[PDB]
């Protein structure tokens, strides 16, 4: 929410995670072996509670879409990394010993357009491609409304250019794992403002139009 820090060098994180990444900066132990983390497989098998420290696999906390990364190529430091996602339905928390991560449930709504042919069963809140009217779809977005585009062929300059002068300002635009999420600014000066993008399904160009 009202924080700009996401690094974990008592790091406590309370933010709306939309495919946002957690940097667990931890030593190799070959230099200082006194330092340790109590959960070995942190961000994969992590305590659900704070006092009743019990190991639970990351599939059984309340995250919906996720991937956990351990990459050890850096000789100075090694990190265990997890991606969080907007699809979570509740405010879960977990503790790596202290690393307090809070995954706040997203208060506003979610709009998903799957122009790609795939079963993104995790978030079935949609328009599909059938709603596209003459191969153009016009999705209005309430304040803070989270729009997601599933099209793999996003080409370039998605949300960068807005037709008809003024461009619809987006606070954050995420392109993670071929998935394009639009965050509505939640405050707009004038309703008459447009943002655009391209997609290529069946070699036809399907384009989405977002307005307040």
């Amino acid at each position, epitope marked *: 929410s009202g924080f700009i820090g996401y690094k974990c060098n008592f790091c406590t994180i309370h933010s709306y995670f939309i495919y946002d990444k957690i940097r667990l900066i931890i030593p190799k*132990k*070959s230099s200082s072996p006194e330092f340790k983390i109590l959960p*070995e*497989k942190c961000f994969q098998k992590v305590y659900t509670d704070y006092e009743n420290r*019990v190991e639970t696999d990351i599939s059984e906390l309340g995250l919906i879409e996720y991937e956990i990364e351990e990459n050890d190529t850096n000789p100075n430091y*090694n990190e265990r990394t997890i991606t969080i996602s907007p699809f979570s339905p509740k405010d879960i928390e977990f503790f790596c010993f202290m690393v307090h991560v809070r995954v706040l449930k997203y208060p506003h709504n979610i709009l998903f357009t799957n122009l790609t042919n795939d079963l993104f069963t995790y978030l079935p809140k949609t328009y599909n491609e059938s709603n596209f009217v003459s191969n153009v779809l016009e999705v209005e977005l309430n304040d803070g409304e989270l729009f997601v585009l599933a099209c793999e062929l996003i080409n370039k300059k998605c949300f960068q250019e807005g037709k008809e002068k003024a461009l619809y300002k987006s606070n954050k635009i995420i392109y993670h794992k071929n998935l394009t999420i639009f965050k509505a600014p939640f405050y707009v000066t004038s309703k008459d403002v447009n943002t655009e993008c391209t997609c290529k399904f069946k070699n036809n160009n399907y384009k989405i139009v977002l307005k307040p």
Partner: antibody, heavy 121, light 105 residues
Framework: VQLVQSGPEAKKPGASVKVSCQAS????????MHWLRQAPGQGLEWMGW????????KYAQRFQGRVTMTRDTSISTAHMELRGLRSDDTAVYYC?????????????????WGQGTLVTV | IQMTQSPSSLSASVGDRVTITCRAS??????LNWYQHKPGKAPKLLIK???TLQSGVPSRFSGSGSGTDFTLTITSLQPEDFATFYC?????????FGQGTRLEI
């Protein structure tokens, strides 16, 4: 990869023993050397680790003032000297390499062990 | 931190599965390694972190459990499997091993 240890030597009571640990097939630096006391009829017990790169040593609370660990970078051999031998200090001593120190995991594992130096007091 | 292996005394027939429960004084998470100490020779590491098997160990050996209680599962007993087994508490600076578990034939 193999780790060779010096032949067993039995010193008299009140004397000192030096045990030689040789590393083959892996870089001697970057892996802690851990010494274990296999007393007959008793479990393995940890004495300490020696850091090859820095040279620092840390010992167990029991052997905080008796055991001494040294090395020689030219020959790349790890040596452990124990003083004040008693009737309970007779055991089989092993030096093992931590394959886990190098990367990733924080745990302490002993992938390869020595032959076992039988010390009789 | 005395880590007593209550099932220490054991006697298992060949071809019969076993389970060795290993328990410590305090919570030590998944920082456990299983060693196979044959008579003479040298101890051999079997399972690293109690969740993944060390290379060179057959598929018969397997590790389970986390936090406090840990389990060994052997699909089929072998004469090579005959040895004494120890637990290594990787957590905390002193490393207290178990008292052993003679898996007698």
């Amino acid at each position: 990869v193999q780790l060779v240890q010096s032949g067993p030597e039995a010193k008299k009571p009140g004397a000192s023993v030096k045990v030689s640990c040789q590393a083959s097939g892996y870089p001697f630096s970057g892996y802690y050397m851990h010494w274990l006391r296999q007393a007959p009829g008793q479990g393995l017990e940890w004495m300490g680790w020696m850091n090859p790169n820095s040279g620092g040593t840390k010992y167990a609370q029991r052997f905080q003032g008796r055991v001494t660990m040294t090395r020689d970078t030219s020959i790349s051999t790890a040596h452990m000297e124990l003083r004040g031998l008693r009737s309970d200090d007779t055991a089989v001593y092993y030096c093992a390499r931590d394959y886990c120190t190098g990367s990733s995991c924080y745990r302490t594992d002993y992938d390869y062990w020595g032959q076992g130096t039988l010390v009789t007091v | 931190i005395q880590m007593t292996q209550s099932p220490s005394s054991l006697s298992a027939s060949v071809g019969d599965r076993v389970t060795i429960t290993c328990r410590a004084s305090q919570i030590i998470s998944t920082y456990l390694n299983w060693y196979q100490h044959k008579p003479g020779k040298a101890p051999k590491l079997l399972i690293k972190s109690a969740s993944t098997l060390q290379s060179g160990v057959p598929s018969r050996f397997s590790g389970s459990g986390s936090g406090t209680d840990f389990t060994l599962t052997i699909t089929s007993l072998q004469p090579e499997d005959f040895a004494t087994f120890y637990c290594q508490q990787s957590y905390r600076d002193p490393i207290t091993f178990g008292q052993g578990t003679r898996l007698e034939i």
